[PDB]
Amino acid sequence: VYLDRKLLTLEDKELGTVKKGYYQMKKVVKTVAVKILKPALKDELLAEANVMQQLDNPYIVRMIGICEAESWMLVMEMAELGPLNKYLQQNRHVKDKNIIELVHQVSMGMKYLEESNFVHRDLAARNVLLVTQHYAKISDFGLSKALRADENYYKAQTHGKWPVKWYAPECINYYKFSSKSDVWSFGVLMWEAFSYGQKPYRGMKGSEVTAMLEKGERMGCPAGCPREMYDLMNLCWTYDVENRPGFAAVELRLRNYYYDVV
Template sequence: MIWAEFSDSLKWFFGAIRRSDAEKQLLYSKNKTGAFLIRESESQKGEFSLSVLDGGVVKHYRIRRLDEGGFFLTRRITFSTLNEFVSHYTKTSDGLCVKLGKPCLKIQVPAPFDLSYKTVDQWEIDRNSIQLLKRLGSGQFGEVWEGLWNNTTPVAVKTLKPGSMDPRDFLREAQIMKNLRHPKLIQLYAVCTLEDPIYIITELMRHGSLQEYLQSDAGSKIHLTQQVDIAAQVASGMAYLESRNYIHRDLAARNVLVGEHNIYKVADFGLARVFKVDNEDIYESKHEIKLPVKWTAPEAIRTNKFSIKSDVWSFGILLYEIITYGKMPYSGMTGAQVIQMLAQNYRLPQPSNCPQQFYNIMLECWNAEPKERPTFETLHWKLEDYFETDSSYSDANNFIR
């Protein structure tokens, strides 16, 4: 491994953490100006990034590697090891925003209690073991509740309207879903299917759907940095599904959930093919397959054939939702009108508050040719490195460009 030279004693080395997670760590109240960490670059394999706290703002620098080994920010001065690099910049800022101080303090975000190990051989749990406490939201398929399992464990409970799915179809899909485990995917714990309403029990995300959050007072206060972070977290979960050859089929803000500590996770993956839906925003094809047309790729509308590339199209629509604070895409247009416009190569226009760089990513997702759309892995690193400073130096003044 490229970091084999590092020992556990190097408190400043944080390994493969995300840019946004580095910021959260550095902005922890006990860190002071000059606090820093070094992390692996996701987009540039074999390279590293330096993240530094400067008066309440986190700044990032790309640490480049020499062909013959060693590291540098500017070719004016190079280092054989990262230890030497850190030693130098703790003595002088030498062009950095500040001189490096103490290594960043590590804080741990608590992981949700996972009861799935208790239900690994018993999918179906006793309905009486679930207590519904507070309704978090509702939709076309039913309601979502905050609940308690066995009077001890907080969980989320999705209650499905009678007739919204065939329990046998769902259980087949759930068997696959339970084996998909990633920090940016909602973990499925257990089910209650022996009577209506069907219960789907998952980890709890207290702030509800991303769609509702974006439209709320709290959501209206976020800005581009947080919006890009949301998109990057969703792309991370989707990149995992991509690596497992699994398709979501209904990626949208309504199917992303918001938890504590600015955590966002993809939910309801796989359920689209077992739901029996009936809604005016759903397009019903001649094969009687119903689609959320405003989020669905044109080729999936035409042929009913879904792929990870049709999920990428939907991700582009999700980016539109994020940047517009939950605005309905193709507002004022019916599903039939959207289909007609897409056939004429129409695309959602650039929102007034949307940077060109962000809109370009959306347009890549909406390439008419599915094969030309980016992978979720590519989308993930593009969003992770969206604000990454290119640490080229001006030798004249040693400031970052």
């Protein structure tokens, strides 16, 4: 998986650092996006590549390799439309059925990740990348973890900077992350998508979000959002781990409703 720096051209125009680039392959160039560094963070990038290396699914961003140069670089195939949130912000015209299509795709990718016993831990509309307006992939495995064969959750020892507004109660309270907590995260993602890329819990501190959730309160239905899709968000936001559905159940719900609506 170790790539030749000579065969990689980087634009100095920053995407997000993530940079666009071109990599001369078997016979053709391939358009790639490149995650670039700058002891502790070296191992994290290499772990993230180690995660990606092991995944093979149409709805997951595919890694080309790693590259030691000016710094450590992670080289992935480019999804050129960028993050789903920014896209929807700039494209209010997208029909509900198109958003339904896209979130279902994310759930198949997440069902695959659940079957493979990996936890994403950063599932948000910002880490959903569009290849085309009708093709989404999950990205950014920086926080992801392979689950031990004997356990269904990963336990963090003390938090870092966490995307708290996407995190399930059990993650906040007990530092426990399972595919069910990704399911809660997916709910917030669905909210973000049907709100055309708006920020969740606008203006609130994470601590205030935790307090709100503990009171049984949830975000309201987004303008125009199919009622069944809002119902699915709420099922995803089941406070109790044991009664929140897994992705197998979420995907099936999404698949059935999608096929019903087309």
